[PDB]
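Hi D.,

Good news: the full-assembly prediction came through. Inputs first.
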Amino acid sequence: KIRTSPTFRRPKTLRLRRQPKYPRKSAPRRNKLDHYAIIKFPLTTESAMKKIEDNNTLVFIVDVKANKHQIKQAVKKLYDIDVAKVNTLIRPDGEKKAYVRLAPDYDALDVANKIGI
Amino acid sequence: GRVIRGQRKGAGSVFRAHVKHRKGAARLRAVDFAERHGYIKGIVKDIIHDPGRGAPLAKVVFRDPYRFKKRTELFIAAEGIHTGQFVYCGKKAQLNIGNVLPVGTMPEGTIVCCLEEKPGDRGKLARASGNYATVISHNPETKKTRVKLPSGSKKVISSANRAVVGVVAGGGRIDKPILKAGRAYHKYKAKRNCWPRVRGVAMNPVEHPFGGGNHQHIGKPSTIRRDAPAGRKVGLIAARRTGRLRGTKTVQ
Amino acid sequence: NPLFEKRPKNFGIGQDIQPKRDLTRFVKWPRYIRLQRQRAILYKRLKVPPAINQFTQALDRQTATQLLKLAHKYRPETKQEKKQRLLARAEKKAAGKGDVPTKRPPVLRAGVNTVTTLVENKKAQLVVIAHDVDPIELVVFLPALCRKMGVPYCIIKGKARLGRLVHRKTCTTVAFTQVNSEDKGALAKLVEAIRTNYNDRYDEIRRHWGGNVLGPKSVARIAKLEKAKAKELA
Amino acid sequence: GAYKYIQELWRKKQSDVMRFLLRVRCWQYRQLSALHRAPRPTRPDKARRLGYKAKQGYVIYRIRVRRG
RNA sequence: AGCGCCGUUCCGAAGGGACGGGCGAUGGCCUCCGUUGCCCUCGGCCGAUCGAAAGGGAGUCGGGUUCAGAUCCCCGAAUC
RNA sequence: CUGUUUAAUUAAAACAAAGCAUCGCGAAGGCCCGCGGCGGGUGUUGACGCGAUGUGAUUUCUGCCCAGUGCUCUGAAUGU
RNA sequence: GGCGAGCCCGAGGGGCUCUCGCUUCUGGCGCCAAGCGCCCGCCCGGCCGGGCGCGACCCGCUCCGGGGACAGUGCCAGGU
Ligand SMILES: [Mg+2]
Ligand SMILES: [Mg+2]
Ligand SMILES: [Mg+2]
Ligand SMILES: [Mg+2]
Ligand SMILES: [Mg+2]
Ligand SMILES: [Mg+2]
Ligand SMILES: [Mg+2]
Ligand SMILES: [Mg+2]
Ligand SMILES: [Mg+2]
Ligand SMILES: [Mg+2]
Ligand SMILES: [Mg+2]
Ligand SMILES: [Mg+2]
Ligand SMILES: [Mg+2]
Ligand SMILES: [Mg+2]
Ligand SMILES: [Mg+2]
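Then the structure:
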């Protein structure tokens, strides 16, 4: 063993992998933000209704802890329809407003009549 | 009363050095094997201007004899050096202007600059623009060397410390008057906030020991001893004499 | 033979770079490395008292090997064979209903309190004193006490080797008190050698001071000045 | 058997056999840190009469304060 | 005494990264590849981190749309 | 001379200014901050520099006094 | 170590007494070893891929220099 460098530093020791004897909370914390809690309210106002005909786009009110991917997955797992893109804004009352554009194969009027708006 | 202007320099609040635009500290190479048992060639790439310094900085690149890498250092540019001139450093380097070598190698009367107090502190003495030291009185036993400093003082130093041969470039900088307040403002703004220069008689009694009264008079003897407390040392500090000079120094 | 040229490199100043040397005496060692090294150098430089200069003046390795060969078969029992002897003697006495199956068990004593009690009561035939005890105050009273009580003591180097004959990390002291008939002559020869080495020279070691050895650079400097002084005289 | 000898050697702490060890230990402890752990007591008799017993749980710290 | 204070390289064992090679094990179509452990070798950080909605900072523009939006929405045409 | 100043009574003959000079300091240092550390500002600095002062461009001048108060130097030569 | 010098004895040689050296016209380049001597599994006296030493002298107890029983630190006492 010849130490050519004039600086002595730490040896690369064996860091032990964590293997605990017992779990710390007995159970995984369940997903509170699931598909029925992300997408809360469809918006049935005048401009949001006009977007259905003139935009091929549904309008929803979403909890603020969700993003575009979770809104897209929630729509595809609840309504079984394809999503082009989701534009999210924050409505100044405190909720998120999501504009979900659908596929050209689907009809926003038919999806709105099936969901009841 | 109120804290005087002389005590506020130690706070470091607004009296620091304007040090951002300065390119770096001008030091020599730290001492190693090649600078004590030989010499090594270095190439000066350019010379630049350090703000707050009238002396030019010299960017001399070296070669590392241990790992393959070109080391860039910052020397004080001596007078008459040019870009591309091979700067030589070490013990047995041949004496030319711009070559740094220990003072035991050079003969007496050699005009050098950027010398060292202790051997191995990368250059302390005689660093201002246009100043030099005079090397005299070598000693084989008890390795010491007398140097005449620019203040006229003769200091006995070691014989192993290094010094670049020549004078510092930029000599005669105090030949031109500043000639207006504007160039003084720009000069001191480049250096450091050292210019709130207000007369101590003109300022208040509660802020300076001299000022006040119906007339602008000092009132107290300005020669104030070295044993004075902080805030008392205004005007002449430990003045052994005053008035117009007679002779050169008359001090051994 | 076809091309196979030699490419020499010159390793001087101002040319091709230096090779990777050993660099042992120039690596920046950490705090505790420097502390133990200059601690050993500090014990080498400074004058030690004549009660702790007895250390490093110890027994040679041949007589220490003889002492270890004597002490190997007076080994105190560990936990495994201790429990084995307890359970085996209990089963033999429960089977045979015997009163006194064991006449005399020979076993050495360890520990500074036990050894000090045995030398104060003159039960110790021989004392083995370890060298590597870092508080020396735990040890410094034992040689004079063994001398004034007449029990021979031997200073030995390595407390780990003395702990491995008692199945422990540190042992610091070994008291030979009981000897067998096949070992009495060998212990008498060892006690004679140890009384020749230590107790007969106790008045010599107690007077001499240890240490006072300068560093080799300063020793070579004084030797160069002495050769210059001889050049001045001749 | 030994701790009375340890105590009586510690008492006259001006003598030449003790003051060398005291100077060496003061250098060794001054060149260490301010607050750290000693894995075993250096004064076993004084530690044991303050309450140290050689078992798992009792921890000796070495600590440095500034005089004046 | 102390909530704490000084300091930013000073008195620090202050890199958990990687090329190549060898050995061992696992997995996938054991053809051929991918991971994990060990060893050798390399590796100035001018020292964690923060600090600009005017500093540095890759790449979207034209038309139309509502009572309130616009380089964001629709159409068309591009780029990182 | 240009500039600055008493915001909410003064704009100046006041302050500042370049110039003239003086003193301390060769870094274990001068002038200072800090309750504290051989902690910090000057200092990424070294007498053409740093710090503290009087006067206030240019021309011509810098009279005489150490009695007093200061400042400084020296010899344990000598009182306290 | 002589491709070197030295002061003497002196026939080859001796080392009383000493110096280290292998970079000075050039705004070039210089790292991760060439060679040598050994040790292995392979082709019948052949070929592949590896390891050690010399190259790069040995030993030592402070990384190297400059101060050093002073400076400073803690307390007490007297000046200012
Ligand atoms: Mg002039
Ligand atoms: Mg002025
Ligand atoms: Mg003024
Ligand atoms: Mg006052
Ligand atoms: Mg323990
Ligand atoms: Mg940031
Ligand atoms: Mg608008
Ligand atoms: Mg547009
Ligand atoms: Mg007015
Ligand atoms: Mg004038
Ligand atoms: Mg200073
Ligand atoms: Mg006058
Ligand atoms: Mg007088
Ligand atoms: Mg030293
Ligand atoms: Mg000395």
